Amino acid sequence: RINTVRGPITISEAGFTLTHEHICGSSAGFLRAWPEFFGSRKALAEKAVRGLRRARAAGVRTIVDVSTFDIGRDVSLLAEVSRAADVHIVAATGLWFDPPLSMRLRSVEELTQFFLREIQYGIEDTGIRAGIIKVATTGKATPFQELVLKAAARASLATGVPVTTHTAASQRDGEQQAAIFESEGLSPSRVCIGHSDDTDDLSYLTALAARGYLIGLDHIPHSAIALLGIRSWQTRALLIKALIDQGYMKQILVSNDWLFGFSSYVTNIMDVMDRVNPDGMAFIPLRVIPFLREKGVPQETLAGITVTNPARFLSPTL
Amino acid sequence: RINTVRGPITISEAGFTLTHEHICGSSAGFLRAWPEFFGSRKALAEKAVRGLRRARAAGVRTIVDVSTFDIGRDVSLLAEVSRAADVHIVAATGLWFDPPLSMRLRSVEELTQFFLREIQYGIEDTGIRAGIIKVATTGKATPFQELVLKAAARASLATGVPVTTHTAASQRDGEQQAAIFESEGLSPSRVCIGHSDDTDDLSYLTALAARGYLIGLDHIPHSAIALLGIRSWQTRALLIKALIDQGYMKQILVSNDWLFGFSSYVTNIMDVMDRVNPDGMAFIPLRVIPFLREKGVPQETLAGITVTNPARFLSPTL
């Protein structure tokens, strides 16, 4: 049983699942303070439903939202949009990078309790419970990172809920994360190590996958912001293929954003519509799957990645 | 007329005013998500009232809270505490350093409108209006800083509400701020340039004061965090005296925190009670004024700084 914003559902109910999305919250709470600019909570919910419905028509049935409290997560809006669009939504607990001092000053022990709260008791006063633990980490490696990583490993160990991370600026930063999880006794299959691009060494990726970790090609870091020039999503899609070819199809998780090349979250607060993904959340099913199929990847394999992988991952396993 | 959290009041009503305080909000909104750790909104309001009442007994009548939306400002809690303690509270508009991308990506024009909203229309859906514009700026000088400074100069020019800033890591960073205000046509008497310590060159301070700016010895930067060793508040108090001696008593604004040497805001989320100011907000009236009096400073002068200076500053002047 997986916790959704409308309650627990069974694994078989999940179906085709999109991971690492940000359905709402791009204002980071500023829409309450400046609805005139940001828009009203209702108009936002409308925008969302419209998008969900298109995705759903495309075949999507569940979505994993990874917004945390510190970046504007609003579970009640999520519950509302979920009901109206008839698409399951899993919400997250965790922290983003550079969290407020209030949390930044907390110990491993306190942090573990806050995450447990959001999962076992519910978020805020909503009675809505989290179904995943999100850990965003930026650039240079800090002690704080370690702590957060450890509190997340413990919350997972206690509950069986999965952990999804963002790897820092360090090299093979993921090996360093693996080490933390492992030293906490957390099974690697409970963890998704996320990456922002296709620049990592395949040898590095495969090795991690060989250890049991899930490999996420899952996010675009939130930034204001060339060397590498600019790759196409087609080229990034190819990485999936390689991993698959290497024998790792069971360990992959991929998001619309990582493929497209831009953070959807940021796009919404930007002036530029040039940055927009005309397919929205339907990008994977509408374009990416077809492309991979055209490259020779079998249907069933693609299905393993968009249905099986997510399900197994979300399913609380102790 | 000055806008308070309970409405407009006249200048003569203000009386003895404490500036640059953070009455609540140290959790940055996390108390909604984790009341078990942070405490309930009621217990917090209780803690606050108790403090206000002590200050009031000491002679304080008004307090300027400089929390902005991005760091947990809660005007409704402020309105409640104000009524219960019978102490006027002025709330702020503005932004802290490192604001979210949502605001970080806004133009001078948009930013001016948001500040105008908070002053002319009200904060959130409270109908409560801001009476000061706060601009916190950290270390290295950015273009973003410039922008925020300019939007604040325009909001002030339109409304007559004052601007209070935090000077960055740059040298004589305040000269650079002055330049911005001046190029916006804002009268210097509408601006308070804040400083975190007593390390600045007196020649630098006096020059700014000579131009008409208010000098704030007003804050302690929010940080996780020696060279300079550790000065006493008595030594910092002496700076006030020098400025006074130089002829600048009409241009000074000073806060409890700057004197004490620690950010009260941070202290509340820390583990260490060792960092606490046993006098709370009554520190200035209970200890600092007596000390200055003992150093020879005249009563009336001290009164000019804690009553007159604040009033004139808050009073919307175009």
- 3-state class of B254 per DSSP? strand
* Radius of gyration over every alpha carbon of chain B, rounded to an integer in angstroms: 18
Residue numbers in B near A33 (CB within 8 A): 69, 114, 118, 123-124
Inter-chain contacts counted by CB atoms under 8 A, chains A and B? 78
Residue (of A77, A148, A58) closest to A112 by Cα position: A148
A interface residues, B as partner, C-beta within 8 Å: 26-30, 32-34, 36-38, 69, 71-72, 98, 100-105, 110, 113-114, 117-118, 123-125, 222, 224, 266, 269-271
Residues of B catalogued as catalytic:
20, 22, 134, 166, 195, 198, 219, 257
Calpha distance A165→B318 (Å, rounded): 52
For residue A9, what are the β-bridge partners? Answer: A2
Residue (of A137, A126, A192) closest to A162 by Cα position: A192
Calpha distance B27→B25 (Å, rounded): 5
- Is A88 flagged in the annotation as binding? no
Q: Is A229 left (phi over 0), alpha (psi -120 to 50) or beta?
A: left
Contact indicator for B71, B25 with CB cutoff of 8 Å: yes
The conformation of residue B29, written as its DSSP 8-state character, comes to: T
Calpha distance B124→B227 (Å, rounded): 43
Question: Closest to B269 (Cβ–Cβ): which among A28, A38, A101?
Answer: A101
- 3-state class of B186 per DSSP? coil
- How far does Cα B124 stand from its chain's mean position? 21
Question: Closest to B103 (Cβ–Cβ): which among A30, A32, A103?
Answer: A30
Contact call for A30 and B105, based on CB within 8 A: no
Residue (of B53, B191, B194) closest to B137 by Cα position: B194
B interface residues, A as partner, C-beta within 8 Å: 26-30, 32-34, 36-38, 69, 71-72, 98, 100-105, 110, 113-114, 117-118, 123-125, 222, 224, 266, 269-271
- Is B20 flagged in the annotation as binding? yes
Residue of B nearest to A104 (CA): B224
User: N- to C-terminal Cα distance for chain B?
Assistant: 13
Calpha distance B102→A112 (Å, rounded): 29
From B289's Cα to the closest Cα of chain A, the distance in A is 32
Calpha distance B299→B304 (Å, rounded): 9
Calpha distance B96→B28 (Å, rounded): 12
Element (H, E) at B19: strand B17-21
Q: Where do the domains of chain A lie, and which CATH numbers do they carry?
A: 1-318 (3.20.20.140)
For residue B4, what are the β-bridge partners? Answer: B7
**Structure tokens belonging to residue A55:** 């995705």
Question: Closest to A33 (Cβ–Cβ): which among B32, B36, B124?
Answer: B124
Calpha distance A88→A86 (Å, rounded): 7
Residue of B nearest to A100 (CA): B28
Contact indicator for B4, B89 with CB cutoff of 8 Å: yes
Query: In 10 A of CB A57, how many CB atoms?
Result: 10
Contacts of B20 (CB under 8 A, 6+ apart): B64, B66, B164, B194, B216, B218, B219, B253, B255, B257, B258
Contact indicator for B162, B156 with CB cutoff of 8 Å: yes
Amino acid at B134: K
**Structure tokens belonging to residue A19:** 């991971």
**Structure tokens belonging to residue B152:** 């604040």
Q: Beta strand B2-4 with B7-9: parallel, antiparallel or unpaired?
A: antiparallel
**Structure tokens belonging to residue B25:** 């909000």
Contact call for A123 and B222, based on CB within 8 A: no
Main-chain phi, psi angles of B268, to 5 degrees: -65, -20
Contacts of B104 (CB under 8 A, 6+ apart): A224, B144
The strand ranges marked E within B67-226 are 88-90, 92-95, 132-135, 163-166, 191-195, 214-217
Residue of B nearest to A74 (CA): B33
A70, A195, A200, A218: which is the annotated catalytic residue? A195
Contact call for A117 and B36, based on CB within 8 A: yes
Calpha distance A78→A85 (Å, rounded): 10
DSSP string of B190-253, one letter each residue: GEEEEESSS-S-HHHHHHHHHTT-EEEE----------S----HHHHHHHHHHHHHTT-GGGEE
Measured on CA atoms in the order A29, A30, A31, A32, is the torsion positive or negative? positive
Contact call for A30 and B104, based on CB within 8 A: no
Calpha distance B236→B242 (Å, rounded): 10
Residue numbers in A near B120 (CB within 8 A): none
* Radius of gyration over every alpha carbon of chain A, rounded to an integer in angstroms: 18
Measured on CA atoms in the order A114, A115, A116, A120, is the torsion positive or negative? positive
- How far does Cα B246 stand from its chain's mean position? 24
For residue B62, what are the β-bridge partners? Answer: B17, B88
**Structure tokens belonging to residue A96:** 């983003």
Contact call for A33 and B98, based on CB within 8 A: no
Element (H, E) at B62: strand B62-65
Q: How many CA atoms lie within 13 A of B169 on its CB side?
A: 6
Element (H, E) at B259: helix B256-260
**Structure tokens belonging to residue A121:** 């008791």
Contact call for B102 and A36, based on CB within 8 A: no
Main-chain phi, psi angles of B18, to 5 degrees: -100, 135
A70, A198, A200, A218: which is the annotated catalytic residue? A198
Residue (of A231, A235, A197, A234) closest to A215 by Cα position: A197
**Structure tokens belonging to residue A44:** 């936002």
Q: Experimentally, how was this structure solved? A: X-ray
Three-state SS across chain A?
Answer: CEEEECEEECHHHHCCEEEEECCCCCCCCHHHHCHHHHCCHHHHHHHHHHHHHHHHHHCCCEEEECCCHHHCCCHHHHHHHHHHHCCEEECEEEECCCCCHHHHCCCHHHHHHHHHHHHHHCECCCCECCCEEEECCCCCCCHHHHHHHHHHHHHHHHHCCCEEEECCCCCCHHHHHHHHHHHHCCCHHHEEEEECCCCCCHHHHHHHHHCCCEEEECCCCCCCCCCCCCCCHHHHHHHHHHHHHCCCHHHEEECHHHHHCCCHHHHCCCCCCCCCCCCHHHHHHHHHHHHHHHCCCCHHHHHHHHHHHHHHHHCCCC
Contact indicator for A16, A306 with CB cutoff of 8 Å: yes
A257 is catalytic: yes
- 3-state class of B184 per DSSP? helix
Residue of A nearest to B221 (CA): A101
Calpha distance B176→B167 (Å, rounded): 9
Measured on CA atoms in the order B182, B184, B185, B188, is the torsion positive or negative? negative
Contact indicator for A205, A171 with CB cutoff of 8 Å: no
